[PDB]
Design a protein around this ligand. Structure first.
Ligand code: MG
Length: 259
């Protein structure tokens, strides 16, 4: 099967100290989309550019130690898009797209809003700029997986403390509505929720201490998929046998090849 892994690595240099490099190979992944490199190109070792000889494409931020995304693939993409073409967001290294024939896979790091109202506003402006891109992408008629950290939990099932987080970034009414539109208006499939309707599937906890031990989790990482490819998804899991990051890798297996 085609195995695609989405992982917010909370700093690729940190994740590599915790075994993430070995996992890229051991996992059997064909494509690994990572978010939050916290590294510029000058900081990336050869094994962070082309892990295990994979092809790698990345978009780093202008600020040091910040953001950045990458897509690693066993096969060579025939086309690569670095950034969205919106300067404000592209300066932060948040979007890479790799094409393999009629398959496209994206690594997306959606802005977080919990730090300050200014950043919640950036987050909302990102949502408004990205929605028409999602619409256009859906209308391409190609097979597309948008992997990444969307920084929004959709429904009560998607986080442990839904009662106490309705005024906090990640579970605001406007944010949840926006994800709902991406699914129900645009017709993207939330692959995890479609595969396993009743299984929470948290992918983030604020630390590896109490927050993790007590499973105070949120499902904020997704694979959003086009219709025909969604029908080819056979299984998924949140990988928790090792801990590389404050997020867990989201792994989906598709009965699909680009040739
Ligand atoms: Mg982080």
């Amino acid at each position: 099967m085609l195995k695609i892994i989405s992982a917010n690595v909370n700093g690729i240099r940190s994740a590599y100290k915790k075994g993430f490099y070995e996992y890229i190979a051991a996992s059997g992944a064909d494509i690994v989309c990572v978010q939050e490199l916290k590294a510029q190109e000058a900081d990336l070792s050869a094994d962070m550019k082309n892990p295990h000889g994979m092809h790698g494409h990345w978009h780093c931020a202008e600020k040091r130690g910040y953001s950045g995304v990458a897509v690693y693939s066993k096969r060579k993409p025939d086309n690569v898009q670095i950034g969205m073409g919106i300067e404000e967001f592209d300066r932060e290294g948040r979007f890479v797209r790799c094409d393999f024939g009629r398959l496209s896979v994206i690594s997306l790091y959606l802005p977080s809003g919990s730090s300050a109202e200014e950043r919640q506003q950036v987050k909302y402006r990102f949502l408004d700029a990205f929605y028409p891109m999602l619409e256009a992408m859906k209308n391409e008629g190609r097979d597309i997986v948008v992997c990444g950290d969307w920084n929004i939990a959709h429904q009560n099932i998607d986080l442990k403390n839904w009662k106490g987080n309705q005024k906090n970034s990640g579970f605001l009414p406007e944010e949840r509505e926006w994800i709902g539109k991406v699914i129900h208006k645009l017709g993207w499939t939330d692959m995890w929720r479609t595969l396993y309707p009743d299984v929470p599937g948290y992918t983030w906890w604020s630390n590896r201490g109490q927050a993790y031990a007590k499973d105070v989790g949120w499902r904020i990482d997704y694979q959003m998929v086009t219709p025909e490819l969604a029908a080819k998804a056979v299984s998924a899991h949140v990988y928790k046998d090792e801990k590389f990051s404050d997020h867990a890798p989201l792994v989906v297996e598709y009965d699909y090849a680009a040739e």
